[PDB]
Amino acid sequence: GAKGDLVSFRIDESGRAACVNAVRQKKRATVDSIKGQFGFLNFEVEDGKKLFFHMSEVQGNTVALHPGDTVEFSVVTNQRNGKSSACNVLKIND
């Protein structure tokens, strides 16, 4: 079976600037809602555009990230559509 073991060497929540999707633009907010494989954070980018993310950007397991929980993400603006998305979603405790 697959063991989802971790290594105490490199994690994103440690402030990984060396690798990142958005230009040092890791934002932190709370999950507003989650729909199937997609989540939304309480971060309105434009006119009330709720920040969306896919469960693939989620921390490890798709069932490990819950709505109403604090998360860390990276807000990358779609230069094509104008909206943004959360990439590299980490579980945050508060």
Curated annotation (Swiss-Prot):
It is found in: Cytoplasm. Residues 26-91 form the CSD domain. Changing K83A: Decreased affinity to RNA. Composed of 5 canonical CSD domains that mediate RNA-binding as well as 4 degenerate CSD domains (non-canonical) that do not bind RNA. Interactions between canonical and non-canonical CSD domains mediate RNA tertiary structure specificity by reducing the conformational heterogeneity. The CSD domain 1 mediates association with the 3'-UTR of msl-2 transcripts. CSD domains 7-9 at the C-terminus bind to poly(A) sequences of RNAS. RNA-binding protein that acts as a regulator of dosage compensation in both males and females. In males, acts as positive regulator of dosage compensation by promoting assembly of the MSL complex, a multiprotein complex that mediates X-chromosome dosage compensation. Promotes MSL complex assembly via association with roX1 and roX2 non-coding RNA components of the MSL complex, facilitating the interaction between non-coding RNAs and mle. Belongs to the UNR family. Interacts with Sxl; cooperates with Sxl to prevent translation of msl-2 transcripts. Interacts with mle; promoting association between mle and roX2 non-coding RNA. Interacts (via CSD domain 7-9) with pAbp; promoting translation inhibition of msl-2 transcripts. This is RNA-binding protein Unr. The lineage of its organism: Eukaryota, Metazoa, Ecdysozoa, Arthropoda, Hexapoda. The chain holds residues 899 to 990 of 1039 of the full protein.
